[PDB]
């Protein structure tokens, strides 16, 4: 009670901890001497934050400098106490966007100093990004996040028991953009774009995506591919490079999550049809294993799959003719099962002309 | 019988009438069996069958709980009387020993080791006593006020104090026996209050089933029956400790909180008493 | 569309027991951090 | 053990426990448990321990040996480890400061241990220990908080 | 289903409604003792008409002393399925595993108590 | 360092007392029903006095739009239709159900429903989608009527008395609570009982409600306990375990109302004065500041309602006062 | 039959979709393999019940007097009822 009611006592405790840590820093192998004190430091402050009916701006203003001092330190126990304090603060109050950005930046930039506390720091970052407002964290700390050793393995180890959705929800919109920049452009780091693509592949293969993260990833890939392909400059060779980069990702996403890209393509059919973007849509669905069943017809803005089964008969002839043309060519967007089911279904309809086709 | 052996069996009302006739002429149909053997065998079979139906086994019987703790008190009174005789009779020969040594078993072992004061100098007492206490015992032997005893007198003292060490040895074995039986009959009760206090509770009620019939408030004040009825008639405050006063949880806590713990412990203990009395599975998970 | 209640410090029993023990008895802060932050996470 | 069958060794041990009843049985029970682990396996030791767990004359080596056997097995059931410690602490908890410290270090160092139990173990140790043993436990735990252990 | 067989006089749904209604009425007239410890005391004092127990106590043995005491005093007893339901009928914010209706001179529930007593003994055949 | 969260905060509810909903038409009779219009800033107030009134919802004045007085028809319950073009009203111990079509300006008394043996019609519910109307009958009978033509579709029978009933959020199921503490789940399209579960510690139920998002089912009982369940738990379990049992109320709960955003649950009891509470739904904790017992204005509560976007909260009592409060967290009507 | 306990109790309305002071007497009961119970009562109606859920499925009002007798053929495709009116 006296800790949060009187802030001078709280400053006394924090200053005592910093002074004692600095005194013992000169002597090697003296971590254990600081055990009990640091535990006391962890035990009181957190409990004080629990006891306060409201946390004021004064408490957070006094606590932030000590938080950064703890993050910059090399003692594992002092960093652990800092992580506990950060977690309790994030749980109890809702903060401004700029200060959450600045706190998450400092958690990310100092992560690799102590290699035995990577998992705790990532879990603390997940808590911070889950209890705060969306879009609080910006894009500046993203490269330092990608450079930590074995990021996806630690994330996979966390994923086996707890929800890791906020961190992936932060990372995925940036990874695709970074891949596109690497393919068409340059990066300051030597091979940063390759590790971006490797990270995205590892996320796809190992960590199961929940809370509609699969839809988010599919929509990001589709929209960003269409946006780049719709630029003023042609860049045909760059478009080919982007195609050969995105093909494994699209195919693996189809393989692990079957129907998500289908739903995304169905939602974007009207928007593609309104503008003159049929050829870009054709190329993108050609990249996938299946999805060439949504090709627009040559003369009108309707999909092949809807054209095959809609009530009007005379244009089903054109749909079946288009399917025959697909059969004669090297099939790359459409798969065998769709064609087989389509022809077996159209053998049995009423109109004899469609039966002949 | 038909499945287990290839044999045909007939049951009929005429068979039942035939059974009735044989029973009526039970004597006169079997010449070998004596009437006395029939009667004695009936009593043995009836009691064993009734014990089997009532789940009476060597483990379930709690009479040995009541017997052991009654004997445990009797041995304590006997041991006290005989030890005073060793200290009084040998105090006329070496009175300084009684004041130096307070452990009664250690006292009698030293007497058995060394007869007279003269033998204390040469003999060694390191195994029985610490070396600094042994030095004090050895030193007091030279400067003594006691009278010299006869050879027959010192032999009589050794025999009595030998009986003391045998009683103390058997009393320890009896206490270990009680710990075995309480953990087997009421394992949950021993976790809650302990072996000694649990056995006193059963001895007071006379049985485990009699103890199970009681409420939690009665168990709390079970030992303190004299203070309870003094307060009830004179309209004063009732007692709050009972036999539970010597339980470990009540003993360790401060005297201010010994009142709250007593009713908290009594309420939880009866739950273990009911479960041990009526449950068919002997385990300490509930008590722990 | 569904509403989810995230864990809170006071509701967790183990965390409260950890916070009610004396400081010198208490183990190192590294164990406390792991247990605390794992308790604050949403279980799946 | 050297020059006779396994069953005869068990027969010798059982006869010895009948003849010796007092404090001299303490050493006999320990050697019986050691033979069971070597002649048999972990299963044989568990059978012998269950039979002897109620014969009250004991020593701390009886429970320390069984704890070591459980640790060597691949399973390492933490429930069994606590179960052995509670039985030993029931017999010698009033005087043994080392046994309480060993139990507390088990909850920290074991991968299956629950370190948050250390608070209640310390509280239980202080009340059960008597006299000088209680103050020895305080010194031993204070040494453990620093790296001196 | 899934009821411990040791709670043999298990009332059905129809009798349960009659029992809990009478228990709720006895609370308004100050004619009910709540709890197993208080229920035991009324049997020793011989001032109880009948005993209601809850069949869902996780160890059932914690209330099995009550049927033995009831058979000595010749007091009828029944079991109900839910201790939560018995607690709300008694007017308590906590679950109750046993309750006892006490003897009152001039009580207005005498006709209702007698009808319930007659209904209970029918379960014993 | 501190900003406002998008979600409704727990503990303290920010409120301001407003002008009474029925200020322009004062009355001394009991208020049976108060409800907000689904698509316009209109509140409808009905009571034991035979009038039905509709007012323009403004925090300052609440001007009168129209008031209609029936001859000998004390309103037991009046509600809007799901689409909101017509008003349905009923009375105590009367067979006729009154339907008022506002767009066509016609007041149709439905005195005769073919195939319905019910002597009086007082308790009824309307589906959220607007295609069905359900009437609570006697001998545990539930009758389903098509909304547009008011013709009987089928009947459902439960064992024991029907205490209360409500529709599912998707309108595909019916929840009916019996007079012995049991709740039945019925399928609307085929009048078959899907499941039968038991409400914990209820001698008999008095009310039941469901949330809009399909997450929550709440049951009120005689002892004053409100149990909140997950909907999936009730469908599959004979003895479901409630998320939280609200113990704050002490007398039988007669009214339950869910917030449109499903962040507030309103509970009330009419047997005691000042017996209304508000519950923060995700947390299942009760706001500590809403019923200001010092003022002593609320008295007995018979009706509660929320505005479509939860900007307003309305309360009807026995004194003929339709109290109204404005919730500052929500900025839309 | 294995454990002689009543799994379900089914309440029969005293009057057809109504209540009356006169008690309703179930004069005959017939049971089908599919799981349906057919009952005839003094109120004059033949009722179908489901054994799994213990709820009424359908009612048929056929007479102004008691319906007193039920009989079902061995092949469960036909049955016959007899009433007080003859």
Coordinates of C-alpha atoms in Angstrom, one line a residue, chain A residues 39-326:
Chain A
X39 CA 13.1 -11.3 -6.2
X40 CA 11.9 -8.7 -3.7
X41 CA 12.1 -6.1 -6.5
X42 CA 9.9 -8.4 -8.6
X43 CA 7.6 -9.3 -5.8
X44 CA 6.6 -5.8 -4.5
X45 CA 6.3 -3.6 -7.6
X46 CA 4.0 -6.1 -9.4
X47 CA 1.9 -6.6 -6.3
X48 CA 1.7 -2.8 -5.9
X49 CA 0.4 -2.5 -9.5
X50 CA -2.2 -5.1 -8.6
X51 CA -3.2 -3.3 -5.4
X52 CA -3.7 0.1 -7.0
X53 CA -7.4 0.7 -7.9
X54 CA -6.1 2.9 -10.7
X55 CA -2.6 3.3 -12.2
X56 CA -2.0 7.0 -12.8
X57 CA 0.4 8.7 -15.2
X58 CA 2.8 9.5 -12.4
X59 CA 3.4 5.8 -11.7
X60 CA 4.1 4.9 -15.3
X61 CA 6.3 8.1 -15.7
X62 CA 8.4 7.0 -12.8
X63 CA 8.5 3.4 -13.9
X64 CA 9.6 3.8 -17.6
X65 CA 13.3 4.9 -17.0
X66 CA 13.8 1.9 -14.6
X67 CA 12.2 -0.4 -17.3
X68 CA 14.7 0.7 -19.9
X69 CA 17.6 0.4 -17.3
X70 CA 16.5 -3.2 -16.7
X71 CA 16.2 -3.9 -20.4
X72 CA 19.7 -2.6 -21.1
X73 CA 21.2 -4.8 -18.3
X74 CA 23.0 -8.1 -18.6
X75 CA 21.8 -9.8 -15.4
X76 CA 19.1 -12.4 -16.3
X77 CA 17.2 -11.9 -13.0
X78 CA 17.0 -8.1 -13.5
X79 CA 15.7 -8.5 -17.0
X80 CA 13.2 -11.1 -15.8
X81 CA 11.9 -8.6 -13.2
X82 CA 11.6 -6.0 -15.9
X83 CA 9.6 -8.4 -18.1
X84 CA 7.2 -9.1 -15.2
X85 CA 6.7 -5.4 -14.6
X86 CA 6.1 -4.7 -18.3
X87 CA 3.5 -7.5 -18.4
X88 CA 1.6 -6.3 -15.4
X89 CA 1.6 -2.7 -16.7
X90 CA 0.3 -3.9 -20.1
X91 CA -2.4 -6.0 -18.4
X92 CA -3.8 -3.2 -16.2
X93 CA -3.8 -0.1 -18.4
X94 CA -4.3 0.9 -22.0
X95 CA -1.5 3.1 -23.2
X96 CA -1.0 5.6 -26.0
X97 CA 0.2 4.3 -29.4
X98 CA 3.5 6.1 -29.4
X99 CA 4.6 4.8 -26.0
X100 CA 3.6 1.2 -26.9
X101 CA 5.6 1.6 -30.1
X102 CA 8.6 2.9 -28.1
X103 CA 8.3 0.1 -25.5
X104 CA 8.0 -2.7 -28.1
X105 CA 11.0 -1.2 -30.0
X106 CA 13.2 -1.4 -26.9
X107 CA 12.0 -5.0 -26.2
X108 CA 12.8 -6.1 -29.7
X109 CA 16.2 -4.3 -30.0
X110 CA 17.6 -5.7 -26.8
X111 CA 16.3 -9.2 -27.2
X112 CA 19.4 -11.1 -28.2
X113 CA 21.7 -9.7 -25.4
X114 CA 20.7 -12.6 -23.1
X115 CA 20.2 -15.8 -25.1
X116 CA 18.5 -17.7 -22.3
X117 CA 15.6 -15.1 -22.1
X118 CA 14.6 -15.0 -25.8
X119 CA 11.4 -17.1 -25.1
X120 CA 10.3 -15.0 -22.2
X121 CA 10.9 -11.8 -24.1
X122 CA 8.9 -13.0 -27.1
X123 CA 6.1 -14.1 -24.8
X124 CA 6.1 -10.7 -23.1
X125 CA 6.0 -9.0 -26.5
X126 CA 3.0 -11.2 -27.4
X127 CA 1.2 -10.2 -24.2
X128 CA 2.0 -6.5 -24.9
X129 CA 0.7 -6.7 -28.5
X130 CA -2.4 -8.7 -27.4
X131 CA -3.6 -6.4 -24.5
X132 CA -3.0 -3.1 -26.4
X133 CA -4.8 -1.4 -29.2
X134 CA -4.3 -2.8 -32.8
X135 CA -1.7 -1.1 -35.1
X136 CA 0.1 0.2 -32.1
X137 CA 3.5 -1.1 -33.2
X138 CA 5.1 0.3 -36.3
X139 CA 7.4 -1.0 -39.0
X140 CA 10.8 0.2 -37.8
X141 CA 11.6 -2.7 -35.3
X142 CA 10.6 -5.3 -37.9
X143 CA 14.2 -6.0 -39.3
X144 CA 15.6 -6.5 -35.9
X145 CA 12.8 -9.0 -35.2
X146 CA 13.7 -11.0 -38.2
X147 CA 17.4 -11.2 -37.3
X148 CA 17.0 -13.0 -33.9
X149 CA 18.5 -16.6 -34.1
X150 CA 15.9 -19.3 -34.5
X151 CA 12.8 -17.0 -34.4
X152 CA 10.3 -19.5 -35.8
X153 CA 11.5 -22.5 -33.7
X154 CA 11.0 -20.5 -30.5
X155 CA 7.6 -19.3 -31.9
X156 CA 6.7 -22.9 -32.7
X157 CA 7.7 -24.0 -29.2
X158 CA 5.4 -21.3 -27.8
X159 CA 2.7 -22.2 -30.3
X160 CA 2.3 -25.8 -28.9
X161 CA 0.6 -24.5 -25.8
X162 CA -0.4 -20.8 -26.2
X163 CA -1.9 -18.5 -28.8
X164 CA 0.7 -16.8 -30.9
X165 CA -1.8 -14.9 -33.1
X166 CA -0.9 -11.2 -32.3
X167 CA 2.8 -11.6 -33.3
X168 CA 2.0 -13.3 -36.6
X169 CA -0.8 -10.7 -37.2
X170 CA 1.9 -8.1 -36.8
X171 CA 4.5 -9.8 -38.9
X172 CA 2.6 -11.1 -41.9
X173 CA 1.7 -7.8 -43.6
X174 CA 5.3 -6.8 -43.4
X175 CA 6.9 -10.0 -44.7
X176 CA 5.1 -9.9 -48.0
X177 CA 5.9 -6.3 -48.6
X178 CA 9.6 -7.0 -47.8
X179 CA 9.7 -9.9 -50.2
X180 CA 8.2 -7.8 -52.9
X181 CA 10.8 -5.0 -52.2
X182 CA 13.6 -7.6 -52.3
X183 CA 12.5 -9.1 -55.6
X184 CA 12.1 -5.6 -57.2
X185 CA 14.5 -3.3 -55.5
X186 CA 17.5 -3.4 -53.2
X187 CA 18.1 -3.9 -49.4
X188 CA 20.8 -2.5 -47.2
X189 CA 21.5 -6.0 -45.8
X190 CA 23.2 -8.5 -48.1
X191 CA 20.6 -11.3 -48.0
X192 CA 17.7 -9.8 -46.0
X193 CA 14.9 -10.6 -48.5
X194 CA 15.9 -14.3 -48.6
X195 CA 15.6 -14.6 -44.9
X196 CA 12.2 -12.9 -45.1
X197 CA 11.0 -15.5 -47.6
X198 CA 12.6 -18.2 -45.5
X199 CA 10.7 -16.9 -42.4
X200 CA 7.4 -16.8 -44.2
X201 CA 8.0 -20.4 -45.5
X202 CA 8.8 -21.6 -42.0
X203 CA 5.7 -20.0 -40.6
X204 CA 3.6 -21.7 -43.3
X205 CA 5.1 -25.1 -42.8
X206 CA 5.4 -25.3 -39.0
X207 CA 2.9 -23.0 -37.2
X208 CA -0.8 -23.6 -37.7
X209 CA -2.6 -20.4 -38.5
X210 CA -5.8 -19.7 -36.5
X211 CA -8.2 -16.8 -36.0
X212 CA -8.6 -16.4 -39.8
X213 CA -4.9 -15.7 -40.3
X214 CA -5.0 -17.9 -43.4
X215 CA -7.6 -15.5 -45.0
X216 CA -5.4 -12.5 -44.0
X217 CA -2.3 -14.1 -45.6
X218 CA -4.2 -15.1 -48.8
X219 CA -5.7 -11.6 -49.2
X220 CA -2.4 -9.9 -48.6
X221 CA -0.7 -12.1 -51.2
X222 CA -3.4 -11.5 -53.8
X223 CA -3.9 -7.8 -53.2
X224 CA -0.1 -7.0 -53.2
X225 CA 0.6 -9.1 -56.3
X226 CA -2.3 -7.3 -58.1
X227 CA -1.0 -3.9 -56.8
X228 CA 2.5 -4.5 -58.0
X229 CA 1.4 -5.8 -61.4
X230 CA -0.9 -2.8 -61.9
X231 CA 2.0 -0.3 -61.9
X232 CA 2.7 2.1 -64.7
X233 CA 6.0 0.5 -65.7
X234 CA 5.6 -2.9 -67.3
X235 CA 8.7 -4.7 -65.8
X236 CA 7.9 -8.0 -67.5
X237 CA 11.2 -9.6 -66.2
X238 CA 10.4 -8.4 -62.7
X239 CA 6.9 -9.7 -63.0
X240 CA 8.4 -13.1 -64.0
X241 CA 10.7 -13.0 -61.0
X242 CA 7.7 -12.2 -58.7
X243 CA 5.8 -15.1 -60.2
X244 CA 8.6 -17.6 -59.6
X245 CA 9.0 -16.2 -56.1
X246 CA 5.3 -16.4 -55.2
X247 CA 4.5 -19.7 -56.8
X248 CA 5.8 -22.0 -53.9
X249 CA 4.0 -19.9 -51.3
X250 CA 0.7 -20.0 -53.1
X251 CA 1.0 -23.7 -53.7
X252 CA 1.9 -24.5 -50.1
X253 CA -1.0 -22.3 -48.8
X254 CA -3.3 -24.3 -51.1
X255 CA -1.9 -27.5 -49.8
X256 CA -2.3 -26.8 -46.1
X257 CA -5.4 -24.6 -46.3
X258 CA -7.6 -25.6 -49.3
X259 CA -10.6 -23.3 -49.5
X260 CA -9.2 -19.9 -48.3
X261 CA -7.8 -18.6 -51.6
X262 CA -11.0 -19.8 -53.3
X263 CA -13.1 -17.5 -51.0
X264 CA -10.7 -14.6 -51.5
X265 CA -10.9 -15.0 -55.3
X266 CA -14.7 -15.1 -55.2
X267 CA -14.8 -11.9 -53.1
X268 CA -12.4 -10.2 -55.6
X269 CA -14.2 -11.3 -58.8
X270 CA -16.5 -8.3 -58.9
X271 CA -13.7 -5.8 -58.2
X272 CA -11.5 -7.3 -60.9
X273 CA -14.4 -7.3 -63.3
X274 CA -15.2 -3.6 -62.8
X275 CA -11.8 -2.5 -63.9
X276 CA -9.8 -3.9 -66.8
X277 CA -7.8 -6.3 -64.7
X278 CA -8.7 -9.7 -66.2
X279 CA -5.2 -10.6 -67.5
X280 CA -3.5 -10.0 -64.1
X281 CA -6.2 -12.2 -62.4
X282 CA -5.5 -14.8 -65.1
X283 CA -1.8 -14.7 -64.4
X284 CA -2.3 -14.9 -60.6
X285 CA -4.6 -17.9 -60.8
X286 CA -2.2 -19.5 -63.2
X287 CA 0.4 -19.3 -60.5
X288 CA -1.7 -21.5 -58.2
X289 CA -2.3 -25.3 -58.5
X290 CA -6.1 -24.8 -58.5
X291 CA -8.0 -21.6 -59.1
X292 CA -8.0 -21.5 -62.9
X293 CA -11.6 -22.5 -62.5
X294 CA -12.2 -18.8 -61.8
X295 CA -10.9 -17.6 -65.2
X296 CA -13.1 -15.0 -66.9
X297 CA -14.6 -15.9 -70.2
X298 CA -13.3 -14.2 -73.3
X299 CA -16.4 -12.2 -74.2
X300 CA -18.0 -11.4 -70.8
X301 CA -17.1 -10.8 -67.1
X302 CA -18.3 -14.1 -65.6
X303 CA -16.3 -16.9 -64.1
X304 CA -16.0 -20.4 -65.7
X305 CA -17.3 -22.3 -62.6
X306 CA -20.5 -20.2 -62.5
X307 CA -20.8 -20.3 -66.3
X308 CA -20.8 -24.1 -66.2
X309 CA -23.9 -24.5 -64.0
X310 CA -26.0 -21.3 -64.3
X311 CA -29.5 -21.8 -65.7
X312 CA -29.1 -20.2 -69.2
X313 CA -28.2 -22.9 -71.6
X314 CA -26.7 -21.3 -74.8
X315 CA -23.6 -19.8 -73.1
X316 CA -23.0 -23.1 -71.3
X317 CA -21.9 -24.2 -74.8
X318 CA -19.3 -21.4 -74.8
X319 CA -18.2 -22.5 -71.3
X320 CA -17.8 -26.1 -72.4
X321 CA -15.9 -24.9 -75.5
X322 CA -13.6 -22.9 -73.2
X323 CA -13.1 -26.1 -71.1
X324 CA -12.2 -28.0 -74.2
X325 CA -9.6 -25.3 -75.1
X326 CA -8.2 -25.7 -71.6

